Amino acid sequence: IPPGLTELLQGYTVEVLRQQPPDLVEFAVEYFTRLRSERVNERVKQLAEKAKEATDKEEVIEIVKELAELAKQSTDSELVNEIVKQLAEVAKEATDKELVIYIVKILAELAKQSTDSELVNEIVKQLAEVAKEATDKELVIYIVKILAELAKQSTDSELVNEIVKQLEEVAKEATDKELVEHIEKILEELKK
Amino acid sequence: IPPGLTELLQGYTVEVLRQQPPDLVEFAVEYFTRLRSERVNERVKQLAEKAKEATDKEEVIEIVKELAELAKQSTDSELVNEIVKQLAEVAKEATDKELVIYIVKILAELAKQSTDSELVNEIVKQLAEVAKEATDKELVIYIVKILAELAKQSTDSELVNEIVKQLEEVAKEATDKELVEHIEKILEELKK
């Protein structure tokens, strides 16, 4: 017998006897989905604390890699959004530009592959936040072009309008005149 | 102990011992989701057979009601798509116009509430099929207006384009001159 099987089935048995569900299969899906959700949520919270306490870029990169793979393998929209929030905090904290770029690309890839419009909209806002904080025009224009790609690959006019609005604020907050003119040119293209 | 608990847990235990999964909770979610899916798929197949053998609309109406509630409570896009196909077959067979209207309204409500664009596109095609087969101009214009509502409530240009294409074919197949002009008038509005 593999370790934990007895305790796992005993836990489900207790709740069956307490709650007296009419359909044990339905109730099993609910019970074990909850346990899976509780465990992965705690793993994500543990990784976030570990990334916050880490004193080395290599430890943070390995945490980011595990978060990216958890997000990719999950179909739970709520969990992916929480992982996106936690990756955003790591990128904000990061002082190694390689790590910020790595996170930006994880977010870009998650957004481009997702069919959940609420999630893509949240990722748009997190990417624009990184661009607003950046003090490197090459990073800003990189993110702006990622957002422009999301807009042109979308047939959802509401997503396009939110990206346009985010890009207008990024142009407002950017300090290099040539960079601002470049963003405004990408903007007018999306408005057409 | 409730009936079936022992056998249910023994079945999961066999597969745990056969496949030796590294994560028993993950494996439980997979195992019980498959059993749930197998059982509801079989229920839908027997409802469809029962609807085909039924000899009175009252029995068919009760079957349609159970299919509509299974579709509403599921989060499995594949199952809902299969239920929509079975409702479409019931509407095709139906010779009581109240039953066809009832099915049209179930499909309309499913589509208007869904965030799954593949499902909405399939339902659009099923509604258009009912309109193409209809020999009652009041039913045709009802369905056309349902599709126009879906188009105007969508911000997805690809859904609007598919609806326009379906409406053009409905107008082609409709035989009443005033009805056709009405559909073409709704068509031009959507193209605008």
Residue numbers in the entry:
A (entry chain A), B (entry chain B): 5 to 196
Authors' account:
Here, we propose a method for generating proteins and protein complexes with complicated shapes using fusions of alpha helices. To design amino acid sequences that can stabilize the alpha helical structure of the fusion sites, we superimposed one or two turns of terminal alpha helices of connecting proteins using a molecular graphics program. Our method does not require complicated computer calculations for the design process and can be used for the assembly of artificial protein complexes with predictable and rigid structures.
In the fourth test case, we connected PKA_RIIα to a synthetic repeat protein, DHR14. The latter was previously designed by a computational docking method, and its structure was confirmed by x-ray crystallography. As a control, we also produced a fusion protein of PKA_RIIα and DHR14 by the end-to-end fusion of the connecting helices. This is presumed due to high structural flexibility at the fusion site because isolated PKA_RIIα and DHR14 proteins could be crystallized under multiple conditions using the same screening solutions.
